[PDB]
Amino acid sequence: PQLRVHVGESVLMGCVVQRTEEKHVDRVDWLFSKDKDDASEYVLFYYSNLSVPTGRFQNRSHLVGDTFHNDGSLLLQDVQKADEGIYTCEIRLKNESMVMKKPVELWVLPEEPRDLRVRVGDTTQMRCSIQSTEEKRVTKVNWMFSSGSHTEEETVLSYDSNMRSGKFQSLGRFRNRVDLTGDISRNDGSIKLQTVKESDQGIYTCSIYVGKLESRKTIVLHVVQDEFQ
């Protein structure tokens, strides 16, 4: 299993021991090892209701798996180039003496540029996702806008699985010209802005959640109209 993430973004490495029933996870070890290197380091380990993110992942790794439905999935945030390698979930279920070994390979791509240049009239995609090996993991996506220094904000678009008719399109400066290019069921929250105007020039800020955990992305959209001389 492969995953590709850009530096800065987040990734959810699934770990779901699929039995024929609900079983409480007794333990998970997440180890990290660089390709072709036998050295390895603990990322996060969990036992008897105790979660211990460790090492240089101490601030970045969370256990987002449901400990009741056989799930020890990991969420890694603010990914760096030094995170490139194999990650191995070692997991054991309660009232059960079998330990499961599931690996996942992580490739890290260079950072996405913060600056985006588009011409008036253009449709422009704005990328935002959590790469994952498991579906339906994103809970909430929130796009805000603003030429934002000492200035207020607007809601571009928002979605919230938790809620019913979760889709919300600005209806402000983004009247019926903004929508999801992908689907959240695949943990993607990318949107497109259809008719770029000068008035749209500012900071768009994506905010993607798996529960309470936030991953923020910010894109600076420049807009140009060629004066004809």
């Binding site: 070890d29 050295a39 211990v52 003496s97 330990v99």
Partner: protein, 189 residues
Amino acid sequence: ITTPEQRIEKAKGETAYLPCKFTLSPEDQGPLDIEWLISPSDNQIVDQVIILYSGDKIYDNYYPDLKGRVHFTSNDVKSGDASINVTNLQLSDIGTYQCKVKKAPGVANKKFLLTVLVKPSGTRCFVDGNDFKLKCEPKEGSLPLQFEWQKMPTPWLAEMTSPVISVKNYSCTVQNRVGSDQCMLRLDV
């Protein structure tokens, strides 16, 4: 730079000593917890718990194959000693043995590669101007095996060492680097 998985070579029917001594650090305040895992034939998809230490109570409760055959050497395991003994070693006990110590936030790990050789014993000596074959077939054993047949047969002298005397027209000593064996046969023309 890292350190490999200690390699332990033992004979059958006896007891393997796997050292796993630890020193706690002041941070390390969580519940102490030890868990030994066996990895049969080293398959990298699954390990099994053999012995576990938790709630300051031991558990030998699993891996029915090892029922009654594995124990923490130490008396006071918390004192910083997690070593174990594996008793009455058999060929099924071959695998990879791992020592996992956890006391939040501290954690340690040791890999042990266990190998179980068998002293050669249980060799059959049997015969099949004919096209004879004399045979010294062992089981169980392990290679590289050596054979030496005796009594002073001249056209057999070359076969003295091979386990088959393909005869055409008193002993058999069997040896490896962990044990020996003696067997006797009779022939008639």
